[PDB]
């Protein structure tokens, strides 16, 4: 019959088939169930959507239309939960969040 990709059955954009293959060849366990790649692809797609939404807003606040690493850095470091998820991660060409301590400001 006509073939439908597994990622289309679940209504996803990420590849269920590629994820299943990576799981099998990664030696994570002897066997991989049918729902594991689907469930994991859904989770990965959700997280990617989060990052990209926040970074797109950050880019729009600069009147740019290409997202650049600086915008990803601003998106991550301004959200508490994403910043907790990526606390030990360095983003190349990211920079820092503008922050000058209070007692340094003129009075």
């Amino acid at each position: 019959a006509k073939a439908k990709t597994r990622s289309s059955r679940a209504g996803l954009q990420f590849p269920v088939g590629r994820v299943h293959r990576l799981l099998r060849k990664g030696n994570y366990a002897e066997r991989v169930g049918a729902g594991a790649p689907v469930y994991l692809a859904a989770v990965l797609e959700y997280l990617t959507a989060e990052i990209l939404e926040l970074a797109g807003n950050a880019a729009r606040d600069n009147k740019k239309t290409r997202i650049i690493p600086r915008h990803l850095q601003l998106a991550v470091r301004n959200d508490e939960e994403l910043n907790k998820l990526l606390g030990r991660v360095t983003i190349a060409q990211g920079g820092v969040l503008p922050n000058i301590q209070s007692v340094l400001l003129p009075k």
Binding site: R70, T90, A92, Q93, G95, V96, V103, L104, L105
Partner: protein, 98 residues
């Protein structure tokens, strides 16, 4: 009377200027030579991909910037605005690096 800014204003201006940009703050060639000099000890006549040196420099600058943030917190804690070597040492000891 030549015009002069008060001591501290230009420092704040630079703080803003460099917290707004994202480029690397160390010169490329000196850092590359530093990498090669360090790597002499482990193996002789090593080659480096260009991206390898860039990765080392990104990681290094990120590390030093974060360390200076912690150092600044220690200096403020001791009721100062000048950072001092003992502030770096306290920060690295609390972190677990010494």
């Amino acid at each position: 009377k030549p015009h002069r800014y008060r001591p501290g204003t230009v420092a704040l201006r630079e703080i803003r200027r460099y917290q707004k940009s994202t480029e690397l703050l160390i010169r490329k060639l000196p850092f590359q030579r530093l990498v090669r000099e360090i790597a002499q000890d482990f193996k002789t006549d090593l080659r480096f991909q260009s991206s390898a040196v860039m990765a080392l420099q990104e990681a290094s600058e990120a590390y030093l910037v974060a360390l200076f943030e912690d150092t600044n917190l220690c200096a403020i804690h001791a009721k100062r605005v000048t950072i001092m070597p003992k502030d770096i040492q306290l920060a690295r000891r609390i972190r677990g690096e010494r």
